[PDB]
Design an enzyme around this catalytic site. Structure first.
Site, PDB file in Angstrom:
ATOM      1  N   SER A 217      20.062  13.984 102.476  1.00  0.00           N
ATOM      2  CA  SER A 217      20.901  15.038 101.911  1.00  0.00           C
ATOM      3  C   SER A 217      20.068  16.226 101.442  1.00  0.00           C
ATOM      4  O   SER A 217      20.415  17.380 101.724  1.00  0.00           O
ATOM      5  CB  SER A 217      21.735  14.483 100.762  1.00  0.00           C
ATOM      6  OG  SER A 217      22.802  13.694 101.250  1.00  0.00           O
TER       7      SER A 217
ATOM      8  N   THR B 172      30.908   5.689 103.228  1.00  0.00           N
ATOM      9  CA  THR B 172      29.754   6.166 103.977  1.00  0.00           C
ATOM     10  C   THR B 172      30.164   6.992 105.188  1.00  0.00           C
ATOM     11  O   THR B 172      29.390   7.849 105.627  1.00  0.00           O
ATOM     12  CB  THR B 172      28.860   4.991 104.383  1.00  0.00           C
ATOM     13  OG1 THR B 172      27.693   5.478 105.057  1.00  0.00           O
ATOM     14  CG2 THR B 172      29.595   4.010 105.256  1.00  0.00           C
TER      15      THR B 172
ATOM     16  N   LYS C 142      30.416  10.301 103.664  1.00  0.00           N
ATOM     17  CA  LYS C 142      29.071  10.868 103.525  1.00  0.00           C
ATOM     18  C   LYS C 142      28.518  11.407 104.841  1.00  0.00           C
ATOM     19  O   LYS C 142      27.931  12.494 104.863  1.00  0.00           O
ATOM     20  CB  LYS C 142      28.097   9.841 102.957  1.00  0.00           C
ATOM     21  CG  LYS C 142      28.121   9.753 101.465  1.00  0.00           C
ATOM     22  CD  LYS C 142      26.921   9.015 100.927  1.00  0.00           C
ATOM     23  CE  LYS C 142      25.694   9.890 101.027  1.00  0.00           C
ATOM     24  NZ  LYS C 142      25.854  11.117 100.207  1.00  0.00           N
TER      25      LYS C 142
HETATM   26  C1  HEA Z   1      19.841  -0.515 105.810  1.00  0.00           C
HETATM   27  C2  HEA Z   1      20.278  -1.734 105.570  1.00  0.00           C
HETATM   28  C3  HEA Z   1      21.662  -2.123 105.925  1.00  0.00           C
HETATM   29  C4  HEA Z   1      22.898  -1.379 105.908  1.00  0.00           C
HETATM   30  C5  HEA Z   1      23.366   0.000 105.524  1.00  0.00           C
HETATM   31  C6  HEA Z   1      23.890  -2.354 106.401  1.00  0.00           C
HETATM   32  C7  HEA Z   1      25.201  -2.011 106.516  1.00  0.00           C
HETATM   33  C8  HEA Z   1      26.195  -2.829 106.961  1.00  0.00           C
HETATM   34  N1  HEA Z   1      25.990  -4.123 107.360  1.00  0.00           N
HETATM   35 FE1  HEA Z   1      24.294  -5.135 107.411  1.00  0.00          FE
HETATM   36  N2  HEA Z   1      22.598  -6.142 107.443  1.00  0.00           N
HETATM   37  C9  HEA Z   1      21.368  -5.693 107.081  1.00  0.00           C
HETATM   38  C10 HEA Z   1      21.075  -4.443 106.616  1.00  0.00           C
HETATM   39  C11 HEA Z   1      22.007  -3.460 106.445  1.00  0.00           C
HETATM   40  N3  HEA Z   1      23.342  -3.562 106.711  1.00  0.00           N
HETATM   41  C12 HEA Z   1      20.337  -6.741 107.235  1.00  0.00           C
HETATM   42  C13 HEA Z   1      18.911  -6.421 106.881  1.00  0.00           C
HETATM   43  C14 HEA Z   1      21.014  -7.911 107.751  1.00  0.00           C
HETATM   44  C15 HEA Z   1      20.425  -9.251 108.114  1.00  0.00           C
HETATM   45  C16 HEA Z   1      20.776 -10.360 107.146  1.00  0.00           C
HETATM   46  C17 HEA Z   1      20.579 -11.673 107.861  1.00  0.00           C
HETATM   47  O1  HEA Z   1      19.418 -12.033 108.137  1.00  0.00           O
HETATM   48  O2  HEA Z   1      21.589 -12.346 108.154  1.00  0.00           O
HETATM   49  C18 HEA Z   1      22.413  -7.430 107.839  1.00  0.00           C
HETATM   50  C19 HEA Z   1      23.388  -8.260 108.290  1.00  0.00           C
HETATM   51  C20 HEA Z   1      24.696  -7.926 108.399  1.00  0.00           C
HETATM   52  C21 HEA Z   1      25.647  -8.932 108.912  1.00  0.00           C
HETATM   53  C22 HEA Z   1      25.371 -10.358 109.310  1.00  0.00           C
HETATM   54  C23 HEA Z   1      25.742 -10.673 110.745  1.00  0.00           C
HETATM   55  C24 HEA Z   1      25.559 -12.153 110.947  1.00  0.00           C
HETATM   56  O3  HEA Z   1      24.980 -12.816 110.064  1.00  0.00           O
HETATM   57  O4  HEA Z   1      26.002 -12.659 111.994  1.00  0.00           O
HETATM   58  C25 HEA Z   1      26.884  -8.188 108.864  1.00  0.00           C
HETATM   59  C26 HEA Z   1      28.233  -8.659 109.247  1.00  0.00           C
HETATM   60  O5  HEA Z   1      29.065  -7.941 109.747  1.00  0.00           O
HETATM   61  C27 HEA Z   1      26.565  -6.834 108.363  1.00  0.00           C
HETATM   62  C28 HEA Z   1      27.483  -5.844 108.182  1.00  0.00           C
HETATM   63  C29 HEA Z   1      27.208  -4.597 107.726  1.00  0.00           C
HETATM   64  C30 HEA Z   1      28.278  -3.599 107.581  1.00  0.00           C
HETATM   65  C31 HEA Z   1      29.680  -3.993 107.952  1.00  0.00           C
HETATM   66  C32 HEA Z   1      27.629  -2.416 107.072  1.00  0.00           C
HETATM   67  C33 HEA Z   1      28.170  -1.071 106.713  1.00  0.00           C
HETATM   68  O6  HEA Z   1      27.751  -0.621 105.417  1.00  0.00           O
HETATM   69  C34 HEA Z   1      27.854  -0.017 107.766  1.00  0.00           C
HETATM   70  C35 HEA Z   1      28.625   1.274 107.522  1.00  0.00           C
HETATM   71  C36 HEA Z   1      27.718   2.392 107.965  1.00  0.00           C
HETATM   72  C37 HEA Z   1      28.076   3.376 108.805  1.00  0.00           C
HETATM   73  C38 HEA Z   1      27.043   4.398 109.168  1.00  0.00           C
HETATM   74  C39 HEA Z   1      29.468   3.491 109.379  1.00  0.00           C
HETATM   75  C40 HEA Z   1      30.110   4.773 108.856  1.00  0.00           C
HETATM   76  C41 HEA Z   1      30.179   5.834 109.937  1.00  0.00           C
HETATM   77  C42 HEA Z   1      31.314   6.392 110.389  1.00  0.00           C
HETATM   78  C43 HEA Z   1      31.221   7.435 111.461  1.00  0.00           C
HETATM   79  C44 HEA Z   1      32.672   6.003 109.858  1.00  0.00           C
HETATM   80  C45 HEA Z   1      33.225   4.831 110.655  1.00  0.00           C
HETATM   81  C46 HEA Z   1      34.726   4.861 110.603  1.00  0.00           C
HETATM   82  C47 HEA Z   1      35.449   4.149 111.473  1.00  0.00           C
HETATM   83  C48 HEA Z   1      34.818   3.276 112.520  1.00  0.00           C
HETATM   84  C49 HEA Z   1      36.932   4.222 111.378  1.00  0.00           C
HETATM   85  N4  HEA Z   1      25.241  -6.720 108.093  1.00  0.00           N
END
Ligand code: HEA
Ligand SMILES: CCCCCCCCCCCCCCCCCC(=O)OCC(COC(=O)CCCCCCCCCCCCCCCCC)OC(=O)CCCCCCCCCCCCCCCCC
Ligand code: HEA
Ligand SMILES: CCCCCCCCCCCCCCCCCC(=O)OC[C@H](COP(=O)([O-])OCC[N+](C)(C)C)OC(=O)CCCCCCCCCCCCCCCCC
Ligand SMILES: CCCCCCCCCCCCCCCCCC(=O)OC[C@H](COP(=O)(O)OCCN)OC(=O)CCCCCCCCCCCCCCCCC
Ligand SMILES: CCCCCCCCCCCCCCCCCC(=O)OC[C@H](COP(=O)(O)OCCN)OC(=O)CCCCCCCCCCCCCCCCC
Ligand SMILES: CCCCCCCCCCCCCCCCCC(=O)OC[C@H](COP(=O)(O)OCCN)OC(=O)CCCCCCCCCCCCCCCCC
Ligand SMILES: CCCCCCCCCCCCCCCCCC(=O)OC[C@H](COP(=O)(O)OCCN)OC(=O)CCCCCCCCCCCCCCCCC
Ligand SMILES: CCCCCCCCCCCCCCCCCC(=O)OC[C@H](COP(=O)(O)OCCN)OC(=O)CCCCCCCCCCCCCCCCC
Ligand code: CUA
Ligand SMILES: [Cu+2]
Ligand SMILES: [Mg+2]
Ligand code: NA
Ligand SMILES: [Zn+2]
Lengths: 43, 46, 514, 144, 47, 104, 49, 72, 227
Positions: C255, C316, C319
């Site tokens: 940002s 987000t 954002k």
């Molecule tokens: C930077 C770190 C970070 C961030 C931001 C996120 C964000 C998210 N994470 Fe994740 N995640 C991890 C790091 C992170 N994660 C890690 C390290 C693991 C591994 C853990 C393990 O070992 O099991 C993990 C695992 C993990 C799993 C486990 C999968 C499994 O075990 O089988 C899941 C499940 O769905 C998940 C979901 C999500 C979701 C739904 C978001 C959301 O917050 C994402 C939203 C972000 C966006 C950028 C979307 C927004 C953008 C738009 C344009 C709007 C969209 C609008 C529409 C589609 C209508 N994450």
């Protein structure tokens, strides 16, 4: 961000020596330990 | 008092390019070479 | 002279410098571990032999990259350098606790390295799930040293979080409100809040794991009365707050960079940024069981949790669309940090959308612990957090050091970095969809070709960080100074010069309400 | 020369199209002929010729808007260094394939993969769209 | 007031405004806010 | 607000009899950031304000930012110049294409 | 004034493009990497017992 | 002859409205291109496979070459 | 099971994996759409020479800005919850098979009547028959009848495993001291290949699952033969 002219400006040859120094100093130890894994496995 | 100015707010001297290049490559090369020697250690164990 | 300046230091800039040095070293340790992992997965066969040493490398890569590269550099280094400079404070509120947090960090690193060196090895994954992490499968001192590494890092970050919240809430000028502060200050406030609200949960969880290992308790032993699902509950109750901690100061950094290099006086919708960061912070606490969609929960529980992932997807999205909206009509200066920020926006969007695909428990039946998850978390971590670290570093390297980087080498570094990470982590989507599980040291032949492609991409990223080191040296090989900085009126940290002196804001800022 | 340590407090001549009228003149101290130009400046501009106009505009400002928006050609050398370093990466991988990596497993030569493919088509592995649906089970050849 | 030759001055020159704008203010006459033009003058004698 | 009070307020602000350098620079620097190619009466007032406080080169960048604030399409700048020509030859101000400042 | 990028940029572009394509076609074609290509339309099936 | 008055005020807004119309059309085009290229052909391929499917003959063709551990 | 240069999923055999595949195509079309929005907007609005760097109305577009991602997330989530409830019906199964994940091998108990149990270890690479698969072939294949509801109770003796077959759309945690349930059906006979998905030590890559699905009469003949 404005920048001053360099107080001690480097030329092309010294930058070539610098990139070669980074490459050789990063690839001798890791490359040496990767060059023979089976020797550590009691060949 | 401590030195104020460009290149003096750092914990290492930057007044020479070559010894600082050697310093950077040995510092970051020790970083890059630590886990490789660890993997060599558990391979050499058994 | 040296000892009192650096080992006994009591101001924020020096501690931020030591954060930057330590995190650069630990990041290159993690990069070596990642090269080792992709070297095992390059060709079919066992270059290293057993899967135990490979799991040791995988767990070491995860801990070193999470708790020792993004965490100290991002939160500690950028907060300590910029937060008393953004709010106009002379120092932190508790500088001795900040120094103690730094000096607890390399004990934690040495304990992690000794955990890797002990012949049992902590090959469990970064999830330290019992009974694999018990005293039967890993009878030894590796898991205990890992647990104490996590203890020391947790105590470090609780101390830093306490110091950050008190120096943001209290050390403002008495006329400014909390909604007149810069956005990175808000991001590290909310980050410190979730840090001290989440870290004691894993502290208690690994304390009970340690007592299960060495004090003959049955917290997670199924033959005594406990179950490992309790450990999974506590671990992920910390764990999803932890990844939101890993991503929120990146949001503040991007940002600030997008606001600066577009020419804008302010980000578009500052209240929207503040509301969305507090919404993400408040709402990351009730989404943890999306990491346990295959453990056998209730179907209503997973319905609630996937709805919770959707309602955490919306703010987000606000954002990222407002990040797009503050590019409107701006004098777009094509700085390298701009390229890092736009790559952040695109690749973090892709990673979040793959996370939304994973968020459905119905498809998380199929895609649990495949490489689709690996592609999701690398497209958020290894691209978003890394690109935000590089954007902050390129943008504030004149402030920290006093010299300006060569922008041509910086653009080349971004180009080969982008190519390397995109070629590394795009075939992992296909490998996850085909069905290769996680934590595998050898795969069937049908997973070979993408693996081969993926391995090549890792080496390109190596070249990226290799020339990155040269960039830093080139600055100190040039010693080109800064006369002036544009837009110095809005940004307070640029107003004392580059670098700022040891004692700043002895005469503090003059801001009035009436 | 070298200016004292207050290089950050006093404002500076900033050159960008977002700020069309900078707060500092670029040329601070002026020669005697430039004082003569500034003395002539209080009269009308009709007795001002071409050279005085362009030199006083260069006194007050560095570059015109046509000079600062010019298309220089750094993207070509940026991507040229990029393909340099990706080529050096490729030769590093040539070395690693030659020395670090050992032999491939024996299930990759042509007879084993032929019998493997015959067992794929024999067991009708994923035969809706993927692999066994690209084969003729009457002509005993692949689909054309 | 000040104890030195200059001071950082932050202007919130309209209410409900997010970004304070900061500028150095030296001795001598009254300098102005760099977007609104409210006059600020430095009297460096306090202790 | 709408067009006519915007135009009237800016032409009255640039026709301040005790004009000095700071507020003329601030008027131009606030006007350029608007989503608006400036109406030629405002530019006429700014050129005469530069003539009032005896500044030449600021008027040349005033004409330059009218030229390059229009953007891609080139039907603005010849129109603005063709309306401002009595001002352009009543003060002696020289247009940026005739001064050689558009030849890069 | 002729800057650094003006002709050296064309030289570095041409050299980088040709060096990268030459070295990558060598490392993909000649060094004996088994790419494990798709066997559709390419292998003939051999009767296993 | 001489020049007329063109639109001086705000072409950024009209550029944004014509290109946000173009943005919605091209994004719906990408989504529909993926759908009509992959998703609906997959659905009709599944329908063609399973609408006229016999499994006893399919098992007899698998067991005629000795693949199962239960049918010899 | 997987073939080289595979991009999408393995194709379906159970009904459940057909609905999962259709929902995956739906949500990936949605991801392609919104990625096209983000990419086209970021390519558009950095490519202009017009500028607007002044004060702008902070709150005049937020209603559509908030209701469009909410309605697209609802449109994603409603079939997600539908197929989420499509895995917890009244099963009324035909067979019940019990799996226990022992320390780097699997064990199978068909003990509805005439208690039968065996062990599954991988055929090693050096001891492969010609034509077989590396890292995917077992000693004793796990024989089930096809197009029938089969209850499959999964646990483990010591540590956490994951009994997974992708092409049938099954993946269930094998937790010690805990008995999870899955249901498995089919529409085609044949061999289906899966492997462990939970970290379980130094041979975690080296436990596969082979589900051989046959008619009912041949399953009865196999059950009579194996005892
Ligand atoms: C930077 C770190 C970070 C961030 C931001 C996120 C964000 C998210 N994470 Fe994740 N995640 C991890 C790091 C992170 N994660 C890690 C390290 C693991 C591994 C853990 C393990 O070992 O099991 C993990 C695992 C993990 C799993 C486990 C999968 C499994 O075990 O089988 C899941 C499940 O769905 C998940 C979901 C999500 C979701 C739904 C978001 C959301 O917050 C994402 C939203 C972000 C966006 C950028 C979307 C927004 C953008 C738009 C344009 C709007 C969209 C609008 C529409 C589609 C209508 N994450
Ligand atoms: C007599 C010799 C001259 C005077 C002393 C200087 C040299 C020795 C020294 O104490 O040198 C100083 C030390 C400083 O180090 C410290 O003070 C503590 C570092 C802690 C690292 C812990 C690593 C893990 C240890 C446990 C395992 O430097 C190092 O030893 C290596 C630093 C190399 C250069 C790093 C560049 C980093 C660039 C990226 C960040 C920029 C940030 C800008 C801002
Ligand atoms: C911060 C988190 C982070 C980062 C950056 C990365 C980066 C990378 N990761 Fe990592 N990875 C994880 C976190 C991370 N990973 C986690 C949490 C797991 C799960 C472990 C488990 O299974 O339990 C994992 C697992 C994981 C696996 C799974 C192994 C397996 O299960 O079989 C693999 C292999 O492909 C992999 C590869 C890579 C690669 C090739 C990179 C590359 O991007 C490496 C390149 C990165 C950099 C070069 C860092 C940038 C740093 C700099 C540029 C220097 C900064 C210094 C200054 C600015 C001064 N990762
Ligand atoms: C079929 C057609 C489509 C049907 C759509 C509607 C489905 C609604 C499912 C709601 C299930 C709620 C539930 O039981 O949650 C359990 C959870 C409790 O789960 P838990 O935390 O106890 O889970 C632990 C489970 N054990 C102990 C077994 C390990 O309840 C809540 O979270 C609070 C009450 C319900 C709130 C539901 C809100 C949904 C939307 C989110 C808004 C915020
Ligand atoms: C071989 C690698 C080192 C080559 C060094 C070299 O040629 O340096 C010349 C130039 C230095 O940078 P230069 O373009 O002069 O200045 C930036 C302008 N804003 O270097 C560069 O700009 C980078 C050229 C690297 C070519 C490979
Ligand atoms: C375990 C480590 C505990 C360290 C600790 O309790 O430190 C107390 C800390 C020291 O005092 P401190 O405020 O840092 O001094 C600087 C300005 N007075 O005191 C403080 O920071 C104030 C009280 C905080 C208590 C934190 C306890 C953990
Ligand atoms: C696959 C990897 C791709 C990596 C691409 C890296 C491009 C590096 C070159 C670059 O960005 O050069 C900057 C240049 C604009 O620079 P400038 O001279 O200020 O142009 C103003 C108009 N006269 O040119 C541009 O900015 C033009 C657009 C190129 C960069 C796009 C980055 C998107 C993110
Ligand atoms: C009728 C609305 C509709 O459902 O359209 C489907 C598709 C994308 O629309 P969407 O909102 O994603 O709906 C998916 C619902 N299963 O929308 C379409 O497939 C649109 C079909 C008509 C326009 C085709 C344009 C093709 C351009 C190349
Ligand atoms: C970038 C977009 C966001 C990330 C998408 C990740 C998911 C993915 O790539 O899925 C592969 C997708 C579907 O694969 P599928 O069409 O089933 O392949 C078999 C027949 N082509 O395959 C495709 O969409 C086509 C190939 C990849 C295109 C990119
Ligand atoms: Cu059992 Cu992995
Ligand atoms: Cu999560
Ligand atoms: Mg699991
Ligand atoms: Na391997
Ligand atoms: Zn003001």
């Amino acid at each position: 961000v404005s920048a001053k002219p360099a107080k001690t400006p480097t030329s092309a040859v010294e930058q070539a020596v610098g990139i070669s120094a980074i490459v050789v100093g990063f690839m001798v130890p890791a490359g040496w330990v990767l060059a023979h894994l089976e020797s550590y496995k009691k060949s | 008092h401590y030195e104020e100015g460009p290149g003096k707010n750092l914990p290492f001297s930057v007044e020479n390019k070559w010894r600082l290049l050697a310093m950077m490559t040995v510092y970051f090369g020790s970083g890059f070479a630590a886990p490789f020697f660890i993997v060599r250690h558990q391979l050499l164990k058994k | 002279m040296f000892i009192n300046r650096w080992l006994f230091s009591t101001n924020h800039k020096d501690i931020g410098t030591l954060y930057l040095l330590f995190g650069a070293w630990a990041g290159m340790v993690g990069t070596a571990l990642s090269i080792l992992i992709r070297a095992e997965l390059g060709q079919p066969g066992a270059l290293l032999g057993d899967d135990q040493i490979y799991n040791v490398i995988v767990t070491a890569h995860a801990f070193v990259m999470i708790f020792f590269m993004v965490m100290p550099m991002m939160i500690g280094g950028f907060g300590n350098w910029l937060v008393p400079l953004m709010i106009g404070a002379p120092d932190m509120a508790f500088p001795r606790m900040n120094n103690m947090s730094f000096w607890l960090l390399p004990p934690s690193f040495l304990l992690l390295l000794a955990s890797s060196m002990v012949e049992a090895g902590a090959g469990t994954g970064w999830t330290v799930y019992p009974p694999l992490a018990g005293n039967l499968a890993h009878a030894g001192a590796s898991v205990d040293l890992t647990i104490f590494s996590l203890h020391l890092a947790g105590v470090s970050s609780i101390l830093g979080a306490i110091n950050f919240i008190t120096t943001i809430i209290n050390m403002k000028p008495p006329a400014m409100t909390q909604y007149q502060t810069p956005l990175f200050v808000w991001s590290v406030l909310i980050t410190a809040v979730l840090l001290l609200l989440s870290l004691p949960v894993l502290a208690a969880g690994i304390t009970m794991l340690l007592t299960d290992r060495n004090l003959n308790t049955t917290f997670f032993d199924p033959a005594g009365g406990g179950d490992p699902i309790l450990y999974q509950h506590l671990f992920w109750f910390f764990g999803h707050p932890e990844v939101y901690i890993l991503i929120l100061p990146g949001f503040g950094i991007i940002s600030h960079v997008v606001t600066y290099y577009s020419g804008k006086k302010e980000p578009f919708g500052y209240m929207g940024m503040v509301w969305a960061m507090m919404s993400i912070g408040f709402l990351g606490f009730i989404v943890w069981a999306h990491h346990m969609f295959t453990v056998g929960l209730d179907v209503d529980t997973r319905a609630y949790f996937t709805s919770a992932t959707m309602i955490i997807a919306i703010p987000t999205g606000v954002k990222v669309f407002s990040w797009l909206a503050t590019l409107h009509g701006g004098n777009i200066k094509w700085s390298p940090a701009m390229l890092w920020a736009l790559g952040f926006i695109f690749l973090f969007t892709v990673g979040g959308l793959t996370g939304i695909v994973l968020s459905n428990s119905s498809l998380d039946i199929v895609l649990h612990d495949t490489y689709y998850v690996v592609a999701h978390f690398h497209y958020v971590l290894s691209m978003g957090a890394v690109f935000a670290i590089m954007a902050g570093f390129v943008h504030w390297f004149p402030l920290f050091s006093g010299f300006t980087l060569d922008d041509t080498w910086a653009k080349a570094h971004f180009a080969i970095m982008f190519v390397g990470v995109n070629m590394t982590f795009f075939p992992q989507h296909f490998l996850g969809l085909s069905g290769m599980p996680r934590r595998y040291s050898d795969y069937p032949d049908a997973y070979t070709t993408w693996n081969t492609v993926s391995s090549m991409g890792s080496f390109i990223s190596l070249t990226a960080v290799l020339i990155m080191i040269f960039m830093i040296w080139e600055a100190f090989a040039s010693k080109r100074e800064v006369m002036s900085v544009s837009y110095a009126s809005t940004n307070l940290e640029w107003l004392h010069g580059c670098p700022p002196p040891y004692h700043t804001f002895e005469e503090p800022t003059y801001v009035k309400v009436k | 020369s070298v200016v004292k340590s207050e290089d950050y407090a006093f404002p500076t001549y900033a050159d960008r199209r977002d700020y069309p009228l900078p707060d500092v003149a670029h040329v601070t101290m002026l020669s005697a002929s430039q004082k003569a130009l500034k003395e002539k400046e209080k009269a009308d501009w009709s007795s001002l010729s071409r050279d005085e106009k362009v030199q006083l505009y260069r006194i007050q400002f560095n570059e015109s808007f046509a000079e600062m928006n010019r298309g220089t050609n750094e993207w070509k050398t940026v991507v040229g260094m990029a393909m340099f370093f990706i080529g050096f990466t490729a030769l590093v991988l040539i070395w690693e394939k030659s020395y670090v990596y050992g032999p491939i497993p024996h299930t990759f030569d042509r007879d084993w993969v032929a019998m493997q493919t015959k067992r794929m088509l024999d067991m009708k592995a994923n035969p809706i769209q993927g692999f066994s649906a690209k084969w003729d089970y009457d002509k005993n050849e692949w689909k054309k | 007031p000040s104890i030195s030759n200059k001071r950082i001055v932050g202007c919130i020159c309209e209410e409900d405004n997010c970004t304070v704008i900061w500028f150095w203010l030296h001795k001598g006459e009254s300098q102005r806010c760099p977007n609104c033009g409210t006059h600020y003058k430095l009297v460096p004698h306090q202790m | 607000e709408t067009d006519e009070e915007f135009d009237a307020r800016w032409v009255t602000y640039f026709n301040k009899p005790d004009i000095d350098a700071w507020e003329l620079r601030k008027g131009m620097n606030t006007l350029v950031g608007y989503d608006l190619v400036p109406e030629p009466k405002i530019i006429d007032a700014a050129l005469r304000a530069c003539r009032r406080l005896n500044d030449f080169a600021s008027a040349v960048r005033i004409l330059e930012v009218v030229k390059d604030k229009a953007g891609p399409h080139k039907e603005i700048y010849p129109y603005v110049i063709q309306e401002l020509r009595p001002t352009l030859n009543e003060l002696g101000i020289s247009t940026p294409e005739e001064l050689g400042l558009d030849k890069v | 004034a002729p800057s650094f990028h003006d002709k050296y940029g064309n030289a570095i572009l041409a050299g980088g493009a040709i060096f990268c394509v030459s070295t990558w076609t060598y490392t993909a074609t000649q060094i004996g990497i088994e790419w494990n290509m798709s066997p559709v339309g390419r292998v003939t099936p051999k009767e296993w017992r | 002859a001489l020049l007329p008055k063109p639109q001086m005020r705000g072409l950024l807004a009209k550029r944004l409205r014509v290109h946000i119309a173009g943005a919605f059309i091209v994004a719906l085009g990408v989504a529909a291109a993926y759908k009509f290229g992959v998703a609906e052909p997959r659905k009709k391929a599944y329908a063609e496979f399973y609408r006229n499917y016999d499994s006893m003959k399919d098992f007899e063709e698998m067991r005629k070459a000795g693949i199962f551990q239960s049918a010899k | 099971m997987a073939y080289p240069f595979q991009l999408g999923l393995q194709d379906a055999t159970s009904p459940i994996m057909e609905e999962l595949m259709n929902f995956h195509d739906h949500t990936l079309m949605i991801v392609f759409l919104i990625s096209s929005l983000v990419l086209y907007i970021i390519s558009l609005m950095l490519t202009t020479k017009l500028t607007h760097t002044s004060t702008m109305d902070a709150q005049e577009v937020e209603t559509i800005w908030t209701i469009l991602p909410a309605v697209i997330l609802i449109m994603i989530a409603l079939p997600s919850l539908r197929i989420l409830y499509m895995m917890d019906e009244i099963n009324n199964p035909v067979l019940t098979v019990k799996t226990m994940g022992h320390q780097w091998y699997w064990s199978y108990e068909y003990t509805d009547y005439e208690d039968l149990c065996f062990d599954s270890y991988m055929i090693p690479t050096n001891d492969l028959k010609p034509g077989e698969l590396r890292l995917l072939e077992v000693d004793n294949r796990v024989v089930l009848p096809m197009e029938l509801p089969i209850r499959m109770l999964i646990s483990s003796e010591d540590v956490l495993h994951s009994w997974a077959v992708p092409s049938l759309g099954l993946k269930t945690d094998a937790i010690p001291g805990r008995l999870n349930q899955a249901t498995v059906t089919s529409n085609r006979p044949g061999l289906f290949y899966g492997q462990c998905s939970e970290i379980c030590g130094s041979n975690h890559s080296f436990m596969p699952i082979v589900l051989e699905m046959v008619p009912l009469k041949y399953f009865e003949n196999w059950s009579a033969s194996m005892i």
